[PDB]
């Protein structure tokens, strides 16, 4: 079985492409796939590099999407082997980006090579949408490329985002969508004063308390067959001057919803304002929504991914929308069906990040099985 | 009517005796009262100066207590006239310490002079207990002097603390005691994690929420004829890393009780622990109690103060235990009866601090009336 995915994953990992830097990872990919008919189109915005590689000119268009940037390593001596010197050890490949998400990219590229070699007259088109900023604020990465593609009507039928999705074994989980994310920055207003004269002050911690309990106990929805219940979480709360004999004048609270399609952005905001208003809270509230939920319901793409996983890995993949998010939240606008599929995400963003070596050629063969079933 | 109190209040105020500095205010007082039979005893501890002046050697011993230190002025150009250049204007005397509490000290000293002159063979003893640190952490001020006096069995029958006690008119309020103060530093423990996986974290804001509501709604006691209900107030709350996609690992809350004699220190602590435990909160809690409540019930001293106020000011003084505290919390240990009595506290610790000029010789004549009724 092929070793080409492994060695390409190594050369990618060896590049310290901390966001938003690419270190010519995109150039490497472009030059390699150019050899088998992929045209390259660079789309740079701000400090972020993006590439849209494409072979073929007609439908169906199957897209692989991913990112070449990695999160910072932390103090390097805490690693067992250096984070940008990929090492084989105990049946694993260790390095920053080994799981998120350079190995996926390497597996897909080799899958393209093997597919195109076995089927040089295949129908449709194969594309790669690669960015150097998914891990940061992501203002100039995939979202810009999607807008360019949508503006010139270059649409996608099937997209696979190579993010790591597995719980333990490769293939046990595919993502067919993600929660939206809605964030609030609440400033509860009181009136500062000496703690010994509470009747001349208004303690914003005390005024907020009944709403906070109602917020943290609230059932937002029950989820459905594809999504878990909408989740509300407080991330920060800060109030006071540091003196233990003063009642603060204001209290700042930061909170977030990861919400399913059972609830809407507008609905959540109205509910939050209603809870605060019914308890007489005086406040300012700034909202920000960094994404809507998206979903690809059971269909050809999910069926095909399951079948390829059953063939290669021997297991039944489960569909999931849990966890964080991905660039799928931008791409779904131009992709009719989109899934995410990759290796274990157990060690992402952590020190001694790794992937099982046996999963590497399996992942690539899954991607190749997907290509064959769609094209 | 005499102008001696005014001019002595001026020379005191003109000294910038920001805690714990005295600027020889205590030396001035000692040298002045030495002329009429007061022996001086310096009791210095750390950076704090204390003086125990006394005329007479037998009971009853009447004590005036007070402090020569003042709080910082703030940026001086914000004042209408300089804070340490005492100015007469619009029937008021302006300056740092004009209300808290140099004018009281000046009024009592002149009262001693007039009393002793009119009654050179009076019974009992007159004492002044003066410190240069009441406004700060007060570890080396009156509390040390009291321990020295108590150790050599030098006890006090009647004490008047010159803190400003008036609401509007001089004499409308006397303090016959104060609340205790019990402070808690609570650390609620959770488990930090990414906000999108709440089932792998424990949000300490959410775990604390039901206890916080129960704490801020709790009726601690109903007070009694002398005290208002025990008061619980949150001063600080802080939790989070600053990232809006992280659930904090811990939450810090600082709170305080100003409590009456209806509740005990131990009882309050047990109640707080019981509320937190019944909601399953996991926490560390450090307590500190900076004073017990103290009370002088209606008696000769309150009766005498009321009667002197009725004579000089023409109004009926009300007894109160509200507000902050004073060095009475130390002195009550050796004083059988103690009250506080001074001018308006409306402008204490603020810029353009002042006292009505007409209240100055009235305050002094009240103190003199107290001396005459007790000695
Ligand atoms: Zn990723
Ligand atoms: Zn990532
Ligand atoms: Zn004072
Ligand atoms: Zn003060």
Q: What is the DSSP letter of A256?
A: E
CA distance A210 to chain B (A): 6
Are residues B153 and B204 both part of a single domain? no
Are residues A300 and A159 both part of a single domain? yes
B270-to-A96, A244, B275, B285, B292 alpha-carbon distances in Å: 51, 21, 9, 12, 17
Q: Is the dihedral of CA B78, B81, B86, B88 positive or negative?
A: negative
Are residues A220 and A344 both part of a single domain? no
Map residue A22 onto helix, strand or coil.
coil
Please report which ligand is nearest the Cα atom of A175.
1
Burial environment of residue A95 by CB neighbours within 10 A (0 to 12, 13 to 18, 19 or more): buried
Give the closest residue to A107 by CA, choosing from A358, A375, A374: A358
Helix (H) or strand (E) holding A186: strand A180-189
Domain hosting B195: range is 179-292
Scan for tokens 């500062």, then name that residue: A192
Q: CA A288, CA A290: separation in Å to the nearest integer? A: 6
Q: What is the resolution of this structure in A?
A: 2.0
Interchain proximity A195–B248, CB inside 8 Å: no
Structure tokens at B116: 């002793």
Whether the Cβ atoms of residue B235 and residue B256 lie closer than 8 Å to each other: yes
Total domains present in chain A: 2
Are residues B152 and B6 both part of a single domain? yes
Compute the distance from residue B26 Cα to the ligand 4 centre, in Å.
18
Are residues B244 and B332 both part of a single domain? no
Question: Which CATH number goes with the domain that contains B184?
Answer: 3.30.70.360
Which among B259, B292, B325 is the end of a domain?
B292
Are residues B81 and B49 both part of a single domain? yes
Are residues A213 and A147 both part of a single domain? no
Are residues B257 and B366 both part of a single domain? no
User: CA-nearest residue of chain B to A258?
Assistant: B196
Query: Which of A179, A244, A256 shows the shortest C-beta gap to B256?
Result: A244
Which among A265, A292, A319 is the end of a domain?
A292
Are residues A146 and A189 both part of a single domain? no
A338-to-A161, A167, A230, B167 alpha-carbon distances in Å: 8, 20, 22, 72
Q: Give backbone dihedrals phi and psi of B105, rounded to 5 degrees, phi first.
A: -65, -45
Q: CA A29, CA A6: separation in Å to the nearest integer? A: 15
Q: CA A80, CA A90: separation in Å to the nearest integer? A: 13
Are residues A198 and A337 both part of a single domain? no
User: CA-nearest residue of chain A to B202?
Assistant: A233
Q: Does A280 touch chain B (CB under 8 A)?
A: no
Q: CA B304, CA B339: separation in Å to the nearest integer? A: 11
Chain A residues with CB-CB distance to B236 below 8 A:
239-242, 244, 248
Q: CA B113, CA B35: separation in Å to the nearest integer? A: 9
Query: Which of A209, A236, A239 shows the shortest C-beta gap to B236?
Result: A239
Chain A residues with CB-CB distance to B245 below 8 A:
235, 256
What residues of B act catalytically? 69, 134
Are residues A60 and A28 both part of a single domain? yes
A330-to-A148, A160, A175, A367, B147 alpha-carbon distances in Å: 12, 13, 15, 22, 74
Which among A233, A258, A292 is the end of a domain?
A292
Are residues B230 and B286 both part of a single domain? yes
Burial environment of residue B188 by CB neighbours within 10 A (0 to 12, 13 to 18, 19 or more): buried
């Amino acid at each position: 079985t092929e070793t080409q995915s492994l060695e390409l994953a190594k050369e990618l990992i060896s590049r310290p492409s901390v966001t938003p830097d690419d270190r010519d990872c995109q150039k490497l990919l472009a030059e390699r796939l150019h050899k088998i008919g992929f045209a390259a189109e660079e789309l740079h915005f701000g400090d972020t590099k993006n590439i849209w590689l494409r072979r073929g000119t007609k439908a169906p268009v199957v897209c692989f999407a991913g990112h070449t940037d990695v999160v910072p390593t932390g103090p390097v001596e805490k690693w067992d082997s250096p984070p940008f010197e990929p090492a084989e050890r105990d049946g694993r490949l260790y390095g920053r980006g080994a799981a998120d998400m350079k190995t996926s990219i390497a597996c897909f590229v080799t899958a393209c090579e093997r597919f195109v070699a076995k089927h040089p007259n295949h129908q449709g088109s194969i594309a790669l949408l690669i960015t150097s900023d998914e891990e940061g604020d992501a203002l100039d990465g995939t979202t810009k490329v999607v807008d360019v593609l949508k503006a010139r009507d270059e649409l996608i039928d099937y997209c696979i985002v190579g993010e790591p999705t597995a719980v333990d074994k490769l293939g046990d989980m595919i993502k067919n969508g993600r929660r939206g994310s809605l964030s609030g920055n609440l400033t509860v207003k009181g009136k500062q004063g000496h703690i010994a004269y509470p009747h001349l002050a208004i303690n914003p911690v005390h005024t907020f308390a009944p709403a906070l309990l109602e917020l943290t106990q609230e059932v937002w929805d029950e989820g459905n067959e594809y999504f878990p219940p909408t989740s509300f979480q407080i991330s920060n709360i800060n109030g006071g001057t540091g003196a233990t004999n003063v009642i603060p004048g204001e209290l700042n609270v930061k909170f977030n919803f990861r919400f399913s399609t059972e609830s809407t952005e507008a609905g959540l905001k109205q509910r939050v304002h209603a809870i605060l208003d019914k308890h007489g809270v005086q406040y300012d509230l700034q909202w920000s929504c960094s994404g809507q939920p998206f979903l690809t319901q059971a269909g050809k793409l999910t069926d095909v991914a399951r079948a390829a996983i059953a063939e290669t890995c021997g297991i039944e993949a489960e569909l999931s929308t849990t966890g964080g998010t991905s660039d799928g939240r931008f791409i779904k606008a131009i992709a009719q069906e989109l899934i995410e599929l990759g290796p274990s995400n157990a060690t992402i963003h952590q020190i001694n990040e790794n992937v099982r070596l046996n999963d590497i050629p399996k992942l690539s063969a899954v991607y190749e099985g997907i290509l064959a079933r769609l094209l």
